[PDB]
Amino acid sequence: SAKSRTIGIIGAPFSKGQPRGGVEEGPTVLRKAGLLEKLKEQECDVKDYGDLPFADIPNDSPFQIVKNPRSVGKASEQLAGKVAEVKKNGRISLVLGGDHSLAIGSISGHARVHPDLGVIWVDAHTDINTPLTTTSGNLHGQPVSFLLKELKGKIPDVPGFSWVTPCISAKDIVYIGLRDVDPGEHYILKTLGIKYFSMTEVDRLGIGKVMEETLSYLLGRKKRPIHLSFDVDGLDPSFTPATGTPVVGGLTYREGLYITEEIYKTGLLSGLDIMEVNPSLGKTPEEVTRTVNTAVAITLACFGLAREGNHKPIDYLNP
Amino acid sequence: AKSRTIGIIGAPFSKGQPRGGVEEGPTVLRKAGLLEKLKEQECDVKDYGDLPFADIPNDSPFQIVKNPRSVGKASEQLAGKVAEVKKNGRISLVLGGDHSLAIGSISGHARVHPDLGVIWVDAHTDINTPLTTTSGNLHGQPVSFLLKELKGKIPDVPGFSWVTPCISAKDIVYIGLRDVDPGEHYILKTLGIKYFSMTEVDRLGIGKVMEETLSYLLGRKKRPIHLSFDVDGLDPSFTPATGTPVVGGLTYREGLYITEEIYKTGLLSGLDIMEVNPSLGKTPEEVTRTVNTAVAITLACFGLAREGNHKPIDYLNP
Amino acid sequence: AKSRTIGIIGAPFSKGQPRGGVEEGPTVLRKAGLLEKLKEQECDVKDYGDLPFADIPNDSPFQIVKNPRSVGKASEQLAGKVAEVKKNGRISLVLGGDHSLAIGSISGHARVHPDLGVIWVDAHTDINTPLTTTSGNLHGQPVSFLLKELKGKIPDVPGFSWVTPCISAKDIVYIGLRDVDPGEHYILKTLGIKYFSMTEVDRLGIGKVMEETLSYLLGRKKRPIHLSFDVDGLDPSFTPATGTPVVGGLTYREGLYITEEIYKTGLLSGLDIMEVNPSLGKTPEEVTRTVNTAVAITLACFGLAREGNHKPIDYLN
Numbered sequence A: 001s002a003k004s005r006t007i008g009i010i011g012a013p014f015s016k017g018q019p020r021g022g023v024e025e026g027p028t029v030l031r032k033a034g035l036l037e038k039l040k041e042q043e044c045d046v047k048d049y050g051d052l053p054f055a056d057i058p059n060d061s062p063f064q065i066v067k068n069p070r071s072v073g074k075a076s077e078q079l080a081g082k083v084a085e086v087k088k089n090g091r092i093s094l095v096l097g098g099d100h101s102l103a104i105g106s107i108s109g110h111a112r113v114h115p116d117l118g119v120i121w122v123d124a125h126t127d128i129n130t131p132l133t134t135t136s137g138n139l140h141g142q143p144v145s146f147l148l149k150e151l152k153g154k155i156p157d158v159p160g161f162s163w164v165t166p167c168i169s170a171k172d173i174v175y176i177g178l179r180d181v182d183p184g185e186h187y188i189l190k191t192l193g194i195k196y197f198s199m200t201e202v203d204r205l206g207i208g209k210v211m212e213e214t215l216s217y218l219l220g221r222k223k224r225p226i227h228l229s230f231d232v233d234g235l236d237p238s239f240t241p242a243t244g245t246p247v248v249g250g251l252t253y254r255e256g257l258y259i260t261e262e263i264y265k266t267g268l269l270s271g272l273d274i275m276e277v278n279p280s281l282g283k284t285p286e287e288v289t290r291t292v293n294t295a296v297a298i299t300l301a302c303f304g305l306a307r308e309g310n311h312k313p314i315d316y317l318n319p
Numbered sequence B: 001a002k003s004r005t006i007g008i009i010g011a012p013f014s015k016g017q018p019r020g021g022v023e024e025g026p027t028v029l030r031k032a033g034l035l036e037k038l039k040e041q042e043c044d045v046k047d048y049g050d051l052p053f054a055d056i057p058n059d060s061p062f063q064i065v066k067n068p069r070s071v072g073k074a075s076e077q078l079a080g081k082v083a084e085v086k087k088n089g090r091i092s093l094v095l096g097g098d099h100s101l102a103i104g105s106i107s108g109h110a111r112v113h114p115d116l117g118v119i120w121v122d123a124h125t126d127i128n129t130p131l132t133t134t135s136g137n138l139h140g141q142p143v144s145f146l147l148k149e150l151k152g153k154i155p156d157v158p159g160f161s162w163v164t165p166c167i168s169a170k171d172i173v174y175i176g177l178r179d180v181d182p183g184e185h186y187i188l189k190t191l192g193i194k195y196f197s198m199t200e201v202d203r204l205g206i207g208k209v210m211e212e213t214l215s216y217l218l219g220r221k222k223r224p225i226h227l228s229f230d231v232d233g234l235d236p237s238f239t240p241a242t243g244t245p246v247v248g249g250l251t252y253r254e255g256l257y258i259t260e261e262i263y264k265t266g267l268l269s270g271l272d273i274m275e276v277n278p279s280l281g282k283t284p285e286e287v288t289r290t291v292n293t294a295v296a297i298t299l300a301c302f303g304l305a306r307e308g309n310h311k312p313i314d315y316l317n318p
Numbered sequence C: 001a002k003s004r005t006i007g008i009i010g011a012p013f014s015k016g017q018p019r020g021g022v023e024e025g026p027t028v029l030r031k032a033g034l035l036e037k038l039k040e041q042e043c044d045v046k047d048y049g050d051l052p053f054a055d056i057p058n059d060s061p062f063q064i065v066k067n068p069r070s071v072g073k074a075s076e077q078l079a080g081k082v083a084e085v086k087k088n089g090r091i092s093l094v095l096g097g098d099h100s101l102a103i104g105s106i107s108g109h110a111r112v113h114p115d116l117g118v119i120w121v122d123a124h125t126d127i128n129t130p131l132t133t134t135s136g137n138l139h140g141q142p143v144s145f146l147l148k149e150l151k152g153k154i155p156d157v158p159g160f161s162w163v164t165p166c167i168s169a170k171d172i173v174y175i176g177l178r179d180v181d182p183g184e185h186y187i188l189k190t191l192g193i194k195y196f197s198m199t200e201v202d203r204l205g206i207g208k209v210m211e212e213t214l215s216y217l218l219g220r221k222k223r224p225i226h227l228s229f230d231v232d233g234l235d236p237s238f239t240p241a242t243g244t245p246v247v248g249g250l251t252y253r254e255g256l257y258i259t260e261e262i263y264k265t266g267l268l269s270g271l272d273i274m275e276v277n278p279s280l281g282k283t284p285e286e287v288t289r290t291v292n293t294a295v296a297i298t299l300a301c302f303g304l305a306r307e308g309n310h311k312p313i314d315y316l317n
C-alpha cells in the first residue's frame, strides 16, 4: 500500500474549547456515515486507534477570561501522545473533531516525529488570538498563537499548557479562506508576515493559482511533510451549516475538493484534522447530513478520491 | 445565417435508463416556448416533430444490458432523421430523452459530416462498454459504441449491428466530469482523450477551459461541432429534475459561457439536450428550474448573448 | 482619512419604476445599523438625512415615459445635495431608491469633480433613451441622460431641462451585464463603451476584471471614482428583494471583491446603493439577506476587508 493512502484514524470527542455543546459527537456521526469503509474502498490502508477518553475536570477555574484552560490543555496533551504514536508507525494521522483547540496537540504530536512539517490552515478564521488579545475566552480560536515560535514570550502561562513547546515558525504556516479575522488577530497576521489566502485572494487569483502558490511556498525549496488542519466553517454555510461559527461568502464545495485533491497529488500529506462538525447546531436533519457528507467528501479527496475518476492497477477492458 | 438555421428533432425515449419520465422531455421543453424563443432571436426554425418510437416488447437483456433492441432501434431511427436534417443544411437539435440516443445523433451527423468534433458536457463519461458496465443502462454507454479505438472491445449487442464507430479518441472533449466509474476512468486515461473534469474547471477556470477546448478541436482545421449536452453536467441547484444528479457541478454561468463560445465559432452543426426528466423533481418549481435552464442553454447555442443582441438597424432612428 | 469620510444621503424614491416598496430601501438599510457599522469601522460619518420628495399632482407621462416631472425633480434635488456633500470634502453615499436617481447623483458629483470615472455594477445597462424604451420606466434610462455623446438624441423631457451631459463614453465601465435590450446593446456597441458582462466575468475572472477596469479609468493619472451599485447586479440568490432580478449574476464574494479593490485605490468619491426593495422578498429571510448583502457591499467600500482590519496601535503590548 502507498504511503499517501496509509491512514491512522484518531477520534477526538472534545467540546470544552467552545461554548456550544454537540461538537463532541463529530467523530461519532463521521463514523456513522461510513468514512472508514469508504476509505478502504479507495485502496487505503486504514487502521483505527479508537476515540480518546477525555476525563472531566469540575474544579477548572478560568484564567483571566480564558474558558476551560485545564480541560483544553489536557485534551491536546492526550492527543499529542496519540498523534506521535500514529506517526512512529509510518501512518497519516487523521484527527476527527471536535473543536479547533485540539490542533495544539495534533500539530505538536506530529512535530515530535517530523519537526520540518508545513501547515495548511483551511478556515474562515485565523485562530491566532493570544490569551491576552481574546475577547470571547474560547480556546478553539487560540491554537496557532500557542504553536508559533515568534510568539515565545507574548503567551502567558495558562494552566494545562505547560507541556506546549512552540514547534512551527511564521514562515511554515499558510491560511486559506479567511473572512472573519479579529483586530488583534489581523495585527499578529501582518506583523509576523504569515502567508495567507483570504476570500479576497481566492476571488482574485482563483483556487488554481491559490494552490499553486501555497504548495510552491512550502515545498518549492525541498520536499517536506504536510499537515492540513481543515475547519468545516472554512467552506460556505450552504455546504457546511452544522458548525459553531458560520460565515457567509465561503469556499465552495468544488474549491474545498480542489484544495484537498492538490494536497494528495504531492504525495506528502502527513497530518490531517477534520474540525468543528457540530450535528446539534443544524436547523434541519438535511443540514446535519449535508455538513457530514461534505466533511466525508473532503476527507476522501485527501487520500486519493479524484473527480476525473479512480481505477485499480489492472486492465479493465481485458481482465 | 447558417449558425441560426435549426431543425427540431423530438426524441421521446426512456428505455436507455430505469427511471420513467425522461421521454416527456421534448413535450415540456416545447411547452416552455423553446421554438417561439428561438424565432424571437432571428432563427430559421423547422420542426420535424416527435419521432414515432414503435414498441419493441420482446426485448430480453444482453447479459445485464437493459432493453438492447429498443435503444438500438431508437438510435438507428434518430440517425436517419439527423442525417436528413443535415442534408437540408440545418443544425440538428435533438430534444431528449436519455443520453443513449447520442449513438444515433452523432452517427447520423457523421454520415453527412465525417470530420466533426464532439464536445461532451456531462457529469459522467458515458464510455462504459456492454462488458465494463455494472448497472447495464445503455444511457451510460453511448461514447463506447462511437469510438474507433474501442473497435474489438464492443460485443455483438442485439439492435446495434448498424453501428459503425465514426469518431476517433482525439475528436472528442469532455467538460464537467465528477462521477466516473473505475472501468470508465481506465478507458479515458488509456485512450488519451482530452478531458476537463470539475478539478480542471476549478484549476484553469471556464475561460481557459473553453479556450483550450476550441484550440484542441479546431487547431488542425476548422470542422463541424457536435455538442452533446447532458443537463446533469450542471449543478443540481440549477438542473435538479434529472436521473443521475451529482453535487459540485458546472454553474448556470459556466454552462452559458460554454454554449456562448461554441456559437461564436460559427461551426455548431449538431446539438443534443438530454436527461431532462420532468417527473424526477422534489417540487414543481424544481421541474420548471431545470427546463428554464435547459432552454437558456439552447438559446445561447443559437445567438443569445448576455452582453445583448440587436438587429442590423439604426435603433436611434427607426 | 479621506477614503473613510462619508456624507449619508437618503433617497426614498420609487416613481422611476412600477414596483412599490423600493422607497423603503434607505429605511431598512438604516434599520440594519449601516451608519453605526461605518462609525465602528473608524469612519467620519455625517447624516444629511432622507430627502423629502413632494408628490407632484397631474404628472402626465411623456409619450410612454412614466412620471417624468417626479423623476426629474428627485434627481434635481439629489444633484444639489450630492454637490453640497462633495464641497464639504466627503464621499457621497446615496441610499436608494430606484436607479433613475443616478442622473442626480452623478450630475451633482460632476459639478465639483468633472474628471470623475463611473463604475456601473448592474445586470442592466440602464442606457435606454426616452425614445428606445419599451416599458417607459426611467430607472432603466439614467446613463442616456448623463452621456455627452448622446446629446441631441435625448428629447426635451419635462423636469430634465436642468440636466447637463457630464460624462463621456470613455469615462464609464459596466460590470455584471446579462439582460441588455436590443436598443441598449446598439448604443453600448456604437459608443464603444468598456463593459465586463457576465460572459467577460466568466472568461477573465473577477481579479482580471477589476485590474483592467481600474487600469482603463486611472491609467493616465489618479482621478475620482463614482461607483453606481445596483443590487440586481448580484445573483438573486444573494439579493432576491429587488425589482428586476436576473439569474446567473455576480456572487456575494465577487461583489465584495469589486468594492474591496475600489477602496484600496483611495479614489472612491461617489457611491450609489440602489434597487433594494424590502416588499419584494418572498420570505422575511429574503428581505434580511438582500439588506445584509447591501450593507456588506457598502462596508467594503469604506475599509472592511475580509483579511482583517486593525487600528494603528500595538495589539500585543
Ligand SMILES: O=C(O)[C@H]1NCC[C@H]1CCC[B-](O)(O)O
Pocket: A099, A100, A123, A124, A125, A126, A127, A129, A134, A135, A136, A137, A138, A140, A141, A142, A180, A181, A182, A231, A233, A244, A245, A276
Ligand atoms: O476567537 C474567537 O473565539 C472568535 N474570534 C474570531 C471568530 C471566533 C473564532 C472562530 C471559531 B474557530 O476558531 O474554530 O475558527
Ligand SMILES: O=C(O)[C@H]1NCC[C@H]1CCC[B-](O)(O)O
Pocket: B099, B122, B123, B124, B125, B126, B128, B133, B134, B135, B136, B137, B139, B140, B141, B179, B180, B181, B230, B232, B243, B244, B275
Ligand atoms: O454507467 C452507468 O450506468 C452509470 N455510471 C456513471 C453514472 C451512470 C451513467 C449516467 C449516464 B448519464 O451521464 O447520461 O446521466
Ligand SMILES: O=C(O)[C@H]1NCC[C@H]1CCC[B-](O)(O)O
Pocket: C098, C099, C100, C122, C123, C124, C125, C126, C128, C133, C134, C135, C136, C137, C139, C140, C141, C179, C180, C181, C230, C232, C243, C244, C275
Ligand atoms: O428599460 C427597462 O425598463 C428594462 N430594460 C432592461 C431591464 C429594465 C431596466 C432595469 C433598470 B435597473 O437596472 O435599474 O434595475
Ligand SMILES: [Mn+2]
Pocket: A100, A123, A125, A127, A140, A231
Ligand atoms: Mn478553526
Ligand SMILES: [Mn+2]
Pocket: A123, A124, A125, A231, A233, A234, A245, A276
Ligand atoms: Mn473557523
Ligand SMILES: [Mn+2]
Pocket: B099, B122, B124, B126, B139, B230
Ligand atoms: Mn450523459
Ligand SMILES: [Mn+2]
Pocket: B122, B123, B124, B230, B232, B233, B244
Ligand atoms: Mn450524466
Ligand SMILES: [Mn+2]
Pocket: C099, C122, C124, C126, C139, C230, C275
Ligand atoms: Mn440599474
Ligand SMILES: [Mn+2]
Pocket: C122, C123, C124, C230, C232, C233, C244, C275
Ligand atoms: Mn438593474
